[PDB]
XYZ file of C-alpha atoms in Angstrom:
131
model
C -0.004 -0.008 -0.007
C 2.672 2.556 1.172
C 6.334 2.560 0.879
C 7.773 4.747 3.574
C 4.976 6.986 5.022
C 4.620 5.381 8.158
C 5.095 6.466 11.726
C 3.092 4.379 14.213
C 2.844 6.674 17.067
C 0.667 9.690 17.858
C 2.964 12.520 18.039
C 0.300 14.989 16.669
C -1.348 14.063 13.463
C 0.661 11.088 12.424
C -0.387 7.661 10.901
C -2.322 9.666 8.150
C -0.352 7.894 5.525
C -0.303 9.207 2.061
C 2.481 7.567 -0.038
C 2.687 4.881 -2.774
C 2.248 5.047 -6.444
C 5.989 5.394 -7.372
C 7.770 7.111 -4.600
C 10.237 4.438 -3.468
C 9.154 1.599 -5.719
C 12.654 1.597 -7.392
C 13.985 3.321 -4.157
C 15.245 7.007 -4.147
C 18.681 6.232 -5.682
C 20.174 9.594 -4.598
C 16.574 11.000 -5.274
C 14.068 10.868 -2.438
C 10.726 12.185 -3.628
C 10.398 14.221 -0.275
C 12.569 16.872 -1.861
C 15.002 18.734 0.277
C 13.265 17.475 3.472
C 15.021 15.151 6.043
C 12.969 12.920 8.482
C 12.986 13.553 12.254
C 12.336 10.695 14.883
C 9.056 12.532 15.937
C 7.661 12.091 12.237
C 8.554 15.575 11.651
C 10.346 16.485 8.312
C 12.628 19.351 7.995
C 14.640 21.109 5.449
C 17.565 23.530 5.871
C 16.556 26.846 4.483
C 17.039 30.403 5.598
C 14.316 32.829 5.366
C 12.855 35.472 7.381
C 9.713 35.658 9.518
C 8.391 38.876 10.769
C 5.981 38.243 13.567
C 2.780 40.261 13.545
C -0.884 40.003 13.838
C -0.465 38.219 17.193
C 2.319 37.290 19.730
C 2.945 33.595 19.010
C 3.638 31.272 21.733
C 6.351 28.886 20.687
C 7.606 25.455 21.352
C 10.941 24.616 22.435
C 13.181 21.500 21.581
C 10.359 19.681 19.640
C 7.607 20.348 17.343
C 4.268 19.128 18.270
C 0.987 20.698 19.291
C 1.499 19.625 22.740
C 5.130 20.431 22.635
C 7.216 22.106 25.521
C 6.202 25.639 26.244
C 8.140 28.590 27.663
C 8.920 30.301 24.628
C 6.708 33.101 23.521
C 7.383 35.289 20.493
C 6.342 38.987 20.605
C 4.979 40.700 17.493
C 7.482 42.934 15.495
C 10.070 40.404 15.966
C 12.203 39.662 12.808
C 13.258 36.038 13.025
C 15.674 34.597 10.608
C 15.239 30.865 10.744
C 17.282 27.960 9.176
C 14.989 25.136 9.717
C 11.655 24.716 8.103
C 9.788 21.650 9.311
C 6.402 20.078 9.048
C 4.644 18.672 11.990
C 1.442 17.686 10.597
C -1.045 20.523 11.245
C 1.375 23.338 10.794
C 4.671 24.281 9.434
C 7.163 25.071 12.076
C 10.134 27.248 11.707
C 13.195 26.336 13.785
C 15.404 28.999 15.058
C 17.894 29.208 17.771
C 17.794 31.612 20.756
C 20.867 33.052 22.486
C 20.487 30.372 25.080
C 21.377 27.850 22.360
C 17.929 26.259 22.384
C 15.994 25.352 19.582
C 12.674 27.013 19.363
C 9.939 26.234 16.933
C 6.980 28.620 15.922
C 3.817 27.240 14.449
C 3.610 30.193 12.064
C 0.686 28.999 9.649
C -1.504 25.859 9.173
C 0.164 23.395 6.835
C -1.093 20.153 5.718
C 0.433 17.731 3.353
C 3.684 15.867 3.028
C 7.228 16.949 1.714
C 7.796 18.778 -0.431
C 4.239 19.895 -1.110
C 2.848 21.406 1.892
C -0.586 22.920 1.702
C -0.813 26.351 3.630
C -3.858 27.711 5.472
C -4.210 30.454 7.945
C -1.137 32.377 8.743
C -0.531 34.392 12.033
C 2.461 36.175 10.991
C 4.370 37.814 8.017
C 6.556 35.633 6.070
C 9.597 37.526 4.498
């Protein structure tokens, strides 16, 4: 049925399973169909990409160390904050941007709704300004 879209655990919106057709039938062979995205143990997929996010509309409470909807709290991003991130990750439900604070901790912001699977992510309602 599917080749590699599996992750039997409930991290957030896992076990949705959308893969097959011809994605790993003959195997990636130096060409994964997930694009530039790499997989994380939580089921999250992430790609290195530097872009900017200017927070606005609302102060966004961020998650630290791991992207989930029930992920660790204690990071809150105020509006008017210009965040230059390096990690773009998909935790099914939102797209999360990974950035590091001066404490050396990895903080993730939920930024906008995103559904889908790497590379094609379907955005929804945004709560900030992507730059």
